[PDB]
Amino acid sequence: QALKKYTIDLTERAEQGKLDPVIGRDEEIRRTIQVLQRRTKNNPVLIGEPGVGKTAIVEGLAQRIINGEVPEGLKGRRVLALDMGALVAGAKYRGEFEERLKGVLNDLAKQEGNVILFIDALHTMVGAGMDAGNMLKPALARGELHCVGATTLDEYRQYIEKDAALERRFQKVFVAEPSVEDTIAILRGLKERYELHHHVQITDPAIVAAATLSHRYIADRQLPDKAIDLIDEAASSIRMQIDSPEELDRLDRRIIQLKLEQQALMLDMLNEELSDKERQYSELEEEWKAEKASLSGTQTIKAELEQAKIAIEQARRVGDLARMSELQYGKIPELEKQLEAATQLEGKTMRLLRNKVTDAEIAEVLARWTGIPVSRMMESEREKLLRMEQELHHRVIGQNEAVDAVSNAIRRSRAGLADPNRPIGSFLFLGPTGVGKTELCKALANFMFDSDEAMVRIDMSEFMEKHSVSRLVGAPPGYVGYEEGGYLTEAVRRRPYSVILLDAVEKAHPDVFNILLQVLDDGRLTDGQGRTVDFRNTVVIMTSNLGSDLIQERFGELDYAHMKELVLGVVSHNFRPEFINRIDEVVVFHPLGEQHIASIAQIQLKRLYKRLEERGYEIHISDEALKLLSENGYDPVYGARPLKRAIQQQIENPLAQQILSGELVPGKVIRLEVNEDRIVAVQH
Amino acid sequence: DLAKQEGNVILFIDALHTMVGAGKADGAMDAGNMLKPALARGELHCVGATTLDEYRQYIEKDAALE
Numbered sequence: 062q063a064l065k066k067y068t069i070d071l072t073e074r075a076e077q078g079k080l081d082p083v084i085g086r087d088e089e090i091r092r093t094i095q096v097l098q099r100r101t102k103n104n105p106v107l108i109g110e111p112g113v114g115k116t117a118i119v120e121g122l123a124q125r126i127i128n129g130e131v132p133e134g135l136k137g138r139r140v141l142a143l144d145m146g147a148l149v150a151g152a153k154y155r156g157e158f159e160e161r162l163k164g165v166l167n168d169l170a171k172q173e174g175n176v177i178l179f180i181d182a183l184h185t186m187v188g189a190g191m192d193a194g195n196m197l198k199p200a201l202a203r204g205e206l207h208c209v210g211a212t213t214l215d216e217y218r219q220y221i222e223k224d225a226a227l228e229r230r231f232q233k234v235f236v237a238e239p240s241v242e243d244t245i246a247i248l249r250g251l252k253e254r255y256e257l258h259h260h261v262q263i264t265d266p267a268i269v270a271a272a273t274l275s276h277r278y279i280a281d282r283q284l285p286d287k288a289i290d291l292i293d294e295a296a297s298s299i300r301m302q303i304d305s306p307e308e309l310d311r312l313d314r315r316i317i318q319l320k321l322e323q324q325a326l327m328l329d330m331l332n333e334e335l336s337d338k339e340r341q342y343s344e345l346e347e348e349w350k351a352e353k354a355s356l357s358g359t360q361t362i363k364a365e366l367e368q369a370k371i372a373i374e375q376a377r378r379v380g381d382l383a384r385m386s387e388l389q390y391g392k393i394p395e396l397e398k399q400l401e402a403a404t405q406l407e408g409k410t411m412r413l414l415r416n417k418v419t420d421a422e423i424a425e426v427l428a429r430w431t432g433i434p435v436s437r438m439m440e441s442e443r444e445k446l447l448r449m450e451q452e453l454h455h456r457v458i459g460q461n462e463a464v465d466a467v468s469n470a471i472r473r474s475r476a477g478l479a480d481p482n483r484p485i486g487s488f489l490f491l492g493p494t495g496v497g498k499t500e501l502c503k504a505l506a507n508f509m510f511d512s513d514e515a516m517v518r519i520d521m522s523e524f525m526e527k528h529s530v531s532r533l534v535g536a537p538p539g540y541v542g543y544e545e546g547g548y549l550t551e552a553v554r555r556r557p558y559s560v561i562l563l564d565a566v567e568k569a570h571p572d573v574f575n576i577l578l579q580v581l582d583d584g585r586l587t588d589g590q591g592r593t594v595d596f597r598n599t600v601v602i603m604t605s606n607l608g609s610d611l612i613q614e615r616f617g618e619l620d621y622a623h624m625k626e627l628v629l630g631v632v633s634h635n636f637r638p639e640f641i642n643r644i645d646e647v648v649v650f651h652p653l654g655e656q657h658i659a660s661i662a663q664i665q666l667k668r669l670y671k672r673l674e675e676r677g678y679e680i681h682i683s684d685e686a687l688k689l690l691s692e693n694g695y696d697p698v699y700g701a702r703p704l705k706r707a708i709q710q711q712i713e714n715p716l717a718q719q720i721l722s723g724e725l726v727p728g729k730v731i732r733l734e735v736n737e738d739r740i741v742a743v744q745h
Numbered sequence: 746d747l748a749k750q751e752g753n754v755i756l757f758i759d760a761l762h763t764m765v766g767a768g769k770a771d772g773a774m775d776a777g778n779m780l781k782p783a784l785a786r787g788e789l790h791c792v793g794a795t796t797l798d799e800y801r802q803y804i805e806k807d808a809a810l811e
């Protein structure tokens with residue numbers, strides 16, 4: 062007829078066990094059971110942030126009607142979830158949709174209030190072509206319909222609160238978003254379910270670490286949805302790593318390599334080596350099959366354990382006498398003890414291993430969701446990270462205080478000791494020009510992301526007027542670029558782990574520094590469209606040169622800390638104490654000596670050799686040429702750039718002059734031997 | 746016809762940004778309100794292929810399918 066075609070039951074799917082065990086939520090289940098049992102305004106709608114399981118509340122309502130802990134007025138009801146899909150999908154002719162909706166309402170009236178209708182996404186139903194606003198409002202008025210709604214907080218503002226005559230036939234059953242602890246409980250029930258499904262065993266410290274790390278690092282979505290996502294995705298990872306091994310991959314590639322080599326050689330010895338490696342391959346393959354058979358038997362017996370539990374729940378509802386004692390005291394202790402025998406057998410035989418989900422796989426799925434390096438240290442990465450100063454002294458020579466403070470900050474983030482209310486670090490680099498602020502920050506991005514300018518580099522010398530804050534926040538509502546956010550918040554909400562480099566910060570008007578007060582205090586920055594962005598995982602590096610005369614005047618015969626004190630007073634004269642209180646540590650650079658410039662000359666000549674060698678020419682140098690480049694490139698007030706433009710002149714002008722001249726032959730060695738006063742190439 | 750395959754078919758939508766609001770008219774279901782149930786229960790194995798700025802424009806304007 063009508064209530065068979067277009068509606069989907071929940072009480073059948075709560076009876077055949079197809080729905081999930083819904084834990085918690087007894088306050089909101091009780092409030093929905095209240096709102097259903099009134100005389101007017103009888104229809105509730107569930108309104109909450111998207112993800113907290115409004116549909117899960119109604120599925121749990123069906124499970125409590127079946128289990129019968131409801132009051133007597135709703136015992137024996139039927140919950141029919143409504144499908145707009147088929148209803149709209151059949152109506153080719155005019156009025157057929159209203160005919161079908163009228164037929165469904167007549168059969169609802171004929172079922173005489175015994176049916177609780179569940180329309181999820183009610184804002185979809187409100188527009189259907191009168192259509193559905195003017196047709197259910199009779200049954201929404203006279204209390205003969207017991208519709209239950211479920212909608213987002215967003216679409217309840219638009220598609221319902223537009224019209225008050227449809228708005229006040231409903232109730233804001235405001236589903237709260239659960240805290241950490243209720244998320245833990247929900248994950249325990251669904252641990253039971255997903256261990257049935259993905260053939261695994263979820264350790265309970267992985268549940269509490271999944272709850273905490275889902276609350277801390279993902280900030281897009283809403284609990285308890287993200288925690289079930291991390292648990293289910295890590296269980297998927299473990300099922301995949303079981304399903305594949307890698308040792309047999311090495312052995313198969315080795316035996317096919319030696320097989321091709323032996324077939325090419327047909328001294329031998331490789332028949333013997335191939336036979337030994339194929340015996341090793343067959344033994345490991347049989348061990349692989351034995352472990353797969355063991356896990357197969359264990360998960361089939363656990364599935365039979367759950368089928369016994371569903372059958373004993375059938376016996377708890379129905380009430381058979383000997384079936385209760387039979388199922389319980391026969392099936393449960395023997396199956397649980399040979400389950401534990403199979404579990405310790407897998408603890409004996411899993412070598413080749415992992416069939417359980419600890420915290421580490423949760424951390425790996427979290428580090429591949431967002432990008433924050435949460436995971437435990439594989440030893441390539443840990444020895445990579447202990448050599449952090451050794452990784453930065455190949456693109457920054459000198460400047461040890463900087464590399465110390467920076468490497469300290471990165472190490473404090475990767476261990477765990479960081480403060481989750483701040484970014485990792487927030488450095489205010491000072492010092493006169495051409496000593497390596499900007500290349501230190503590019504050295505960080507080259508370490509961390511394996512690319513030089515793969516980082517969010519904001520030029521703070523565009524913000525010389527007050528109205529250009531809005532380039533980085535974005536546009537307030539009802540203006541031009543409101544559809545397109547900022548530049549800072551968008552490119553961080555994409556990739557939460559980056560290095561935001563504020564280029565030469567002292568030029569801007571002080572308002573952008575007020576924006577930075579928000580950022581460096583609490584990692585949040587509400588952009589144009591009214592949403593926060595989690596900056597708790599970046600390294601907001603800000604450069605400057607506010608103490609050039611002071612540092613170039615007194616870095617001699619003054620230690621590091623007192624220099625920091627005196628330049629700290631100078632920056633206090635240029636900034637408000639709000640902003641420089643927020644800073645992690647102002648580190649101070651210093652102008653370069655002669656040997657530092659010699660090393661910089663060596664580095665720049667290395668990249669010049671790189672350029673001309675990928676061109677195809679090969680160049681050696683005399684040490685006297687390097688000494689002339691060191692002596693001409695030295696001056697304090699302009700930093701390490703007179704070295705680069707002296708190199709530019711005294712090599713790149715005559716050398717490019719002669720390479721374009723058709724003179725210098727490819728392949729031969731271009732020797733940069735000095736003249737009496739200059740540097741020139743020769744060819745022999 | 747994907748339910749009659751029993752999880753055998755990986756459905757590939759290209760331009761997932763397009764799908765939100767495909768058919769919105771006077772009497773419509775918007776094509777996101779017919780895949781929100783089927784995607785909600787995991788019965789469909791859809792694979793999305795969208796841009797990044799099309800993702801800011803089209804899907805995150807609609808959190809229930811985000």
Ligand SMILES: Nc1ncnc2c1ncn2[C@@H]1O[C@H](COP(=O)(O)OP(=O)(O)OP(O)(O)=S)[C@@H](O)[C@H]1O
Nearest residue numbers: 081082083084085111112113114115116117247809
């Ligand atoms: N308290 C809970 N107990 C058990 N499972 C829950 C709970 N909260 C959420 N879930 C699970 O979360 C998943 C989706 O929950 P839903 O409430 O259906 O999401 P939703 O409310 O439909 O969000 P939208 O905006 O409607 S898509 C299902 O797997 C539920 O079982």
Ligand SMILES: Nc1ncnc2c1ncn2[C@@H]1O[C@H](COP(=O)(O)OP(=O)(O)OP(O)(O)=S)[C@@H](O)[C@H]1O
Nearest residue numbers: 456457458493494495496497498499500606661701
């Ligand atoms: N300590 C250094 N080690 C290596 N290269 C350096 C060093 N200092 C400067 N350079 C070179 O000089 C350029 C970087 O100069 P920077 O010091 O970054 O200028 P800056 O730090 O922004 O100071 P200002 O604000 O520009 S005056 C690049 O070409 C580098 O190769």
